[PDB]
Amino acid sequence: VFTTVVSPLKNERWWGGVVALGHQMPFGQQLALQDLARNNRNNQLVPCMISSAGRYIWAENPFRFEMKNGDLIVYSDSEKLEPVSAGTTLKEAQLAVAKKHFPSSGQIPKEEFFSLPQYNTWIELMYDQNQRDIMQYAHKVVENGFPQGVFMIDDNWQRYYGNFDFKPEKFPDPKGMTDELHRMGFKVMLWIAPYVSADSPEFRILEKKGYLLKKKDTGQPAIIHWWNGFSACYDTTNPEAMEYLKQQLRANQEKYGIDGFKFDGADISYMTPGEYDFYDKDATPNTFMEKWAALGLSFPYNELRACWKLGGQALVQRLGDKDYSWNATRMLIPDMLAAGLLGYYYTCPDMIGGGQYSAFLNVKEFDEELIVRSCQVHALMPMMQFSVAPWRILSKENADICAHYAHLHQKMSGYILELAKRAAETGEPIVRSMEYEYPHQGFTDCKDQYMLGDKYLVAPMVTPGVKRTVKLPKGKWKDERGQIFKGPKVIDTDVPLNRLPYYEKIK
């Protein structure tokens, strides 16, 4: 175990490792041990640590890290690891490691991702994915003046896991439903995973072809316990398995008219390293998680959530579904900022109000502020995902508020699209921490405001009430109202429910 105690420099704080831990970033002085080989925490992983003092670590292989007594300690069995002086800022260190170790492809996903909101049927239809309600939802989007965008039909549309046809008892005419949504100006995407019903026609076919993931000491297909139950699994190291699976999906796209797929669930968190006979003998569970994600390169409409490396790449990267609570709402920015720093620039900031359906089931009188404040966050991010039906849970007033912010995102999208090409080519995030853009200027822990590009500072409401701190750095700052300021100084502002604070830099 090639240990490397990294004592910090002056003021030096550390980011990196698990994208789910963006909210706990930069790291405090005591941090529990993190094993990249075992837990992705229902999110993304990269073997990268970056500091505000212009240093970084990169590993070819997963490792363990922790903070003890201010020190960053790092344990790898495969290699002994050293930091790198690349400048003197967080920004400088991020661009060195990126350009060197996860250079951007020079390409992006579809531009519709950034322009349009995403509407996930998870919170509303849950498992009862059926044509009827999909069209009810799709119309109510329009009727309530929300923009059309990517309609992401979630789990339980397919007959069973491994099958890529619709349940016909739920979809009397899915080809026509797709046309209908296309005429209404939407895009459509389907939820998929490497899991396969273990007793299915498809299972045996794949098992014959050795396309399933195989258990070591048994040569048998590996049966994975995951959030839905136990399934056989596609070996994502097997290229012919992925070749076949690719054509599986294309056939769906012709047959039904689907634009792309949501790739969810290559969690290494379910896998136990070493137990598997991967097709690739130099492959880890991490490799497999990377290979499920790589599959999305072959589809310009794609979104995923589990990933290892694949920094700089044209991959929509969703933040893991979280909870209907303020604490969780506050984690959107910090978690998202990290995603960018660690390669995954194009980022959907999770679902609106919570990606957990059970919170919205059995509900009568909601906390309507949280929904709206949560909306505001998304407005000035690369993408914006809803799931719950504002029109159903909110007041008509509050719905329209959200519908403003959807149109405000859509207004902003020209600039977001611009930034994404700068991300894909330079390797600058779209959404940047304050310490990123303004290093050593006391914005190191600043976890409740961020830069959209290097132009707009955004300090949305992340708590109940109608007041807010804002640290402005040096420069001339015009809020959305139009009122000019200049920093460095720390203003208080009046934030009504239908106010998102953001400040254009005007020289």
Added chain:
Amino acid sequence: NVFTTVVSPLKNERWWGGVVALGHQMPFGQQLALQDLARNNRNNQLVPCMISSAGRYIWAENPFRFEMKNGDLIVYSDSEKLEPVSAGTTLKEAQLAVAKKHFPSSGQIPKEEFFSLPQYNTWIELMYDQNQRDIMQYAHKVVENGFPQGVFMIDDNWQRYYGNFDFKPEKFPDPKGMTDELHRMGFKVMLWIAPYVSADSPEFRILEKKGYLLKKKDTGQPAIIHWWNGFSACYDTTNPEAMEYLKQQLRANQEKYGIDGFKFDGADISYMTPGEYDFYDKDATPNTFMEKWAALGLSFPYNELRACWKLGGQALVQRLGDKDYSWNATRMLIPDMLAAGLLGYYYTCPDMIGGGQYSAFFDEELIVRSCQVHALMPMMQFSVAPWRILSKENADICAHYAHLHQKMSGYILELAKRAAETGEPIVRSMEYEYPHQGFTDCKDQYMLGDKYLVAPMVTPGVKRTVKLPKGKWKDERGQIFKGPKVIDTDVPLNRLPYYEKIK
């Protein structure tokens, strides 16, 4: 302890019992490899019962191991020390003692249409692709080609997936109407089911919540069984509420779709590893589980099963494992069918015709001779389509024999009530009806009741040995004989040899 019991044979004494799949290797030679009732059912039924031709028997409440070494029957039980019992001096006498004592008959039977009618299984024809269209094509071709109507047993893959008991609607546009249609044509319909549940299915989660799945011990988590179709979670059959629920699962199917009963297939203890599981019943073994999947059939008068432990005397249709397409396998039907009888599974379906393994599908004689065997058994199952694989001539031959079974059914129905009340098999070994008279390994002829001796063709050609015992014997042609003597006969393809006892 391993409570071992070396059981020396008496004079000339031969032994039956244990595994119904081993009926063909019965009675047992001097060397039989070790047989563990706790582990392998051999794709068929199991009973803790051994019977001898010298009027002796063994019974165990629990599984055991047995084997033949050097003439001796050796017996290994962890739970109990085991000993034989003098019940008369014949095989017949010993069978009726153990039956009346340890698996007495219920006094009831399954539906009478089982015995009257042939069964038509769609596995060989449709296989995995079970669909309304081809079911109706097959059903008509039965009729068109002059074969009789009977129980239409739609086999695996009609259901949306494992655990679900609705049809695939992409295959069944109107399954309720298809049921009526088949009822109007004078058929009955039965559906294939198993305790296996897709491990990732809605139903899996529902059951998982209710603790209705079979639970692994060390994890209290669903037990995931690797079986012939793949890996599935499983219904805990020892959980009575689970089975309560499952019963209503099926009844709902019967109203909704119009189904008369179900084929219960796959409680194999062969898949389970004893001890690893938290059964609901804490006293339960894998064997218990296997018994409880089968007990489920009591609740539906249209039922057929294949995996089972105990449940002797009971109104349960019992099938033989899906055999091979060869003569080798054809020869085992009779002695396997006889072994069912002895062991309490009186009402018995004889495997499939031609082979219950679809991959094999012509040698048209084998099919027709295989048909002839079934003709004079309690039931008769086809699967492969004679009209497709045979000459029209040979099809008609089979169609006669189906009509001959149907003719004979009055007597078979009579015998089933004698079985359900006395505990005498419908189909009886020669040694059963005529003990000590050198019919001990008679494996190519049997008694239908105590009336008709049946010596069907068991090999290619057109000649056949027949041991007649004492008594007056009229063949089907009408020509009278008397034994004990050993006749030859001319058996053309369209001849089933059988001899009525006329005094």
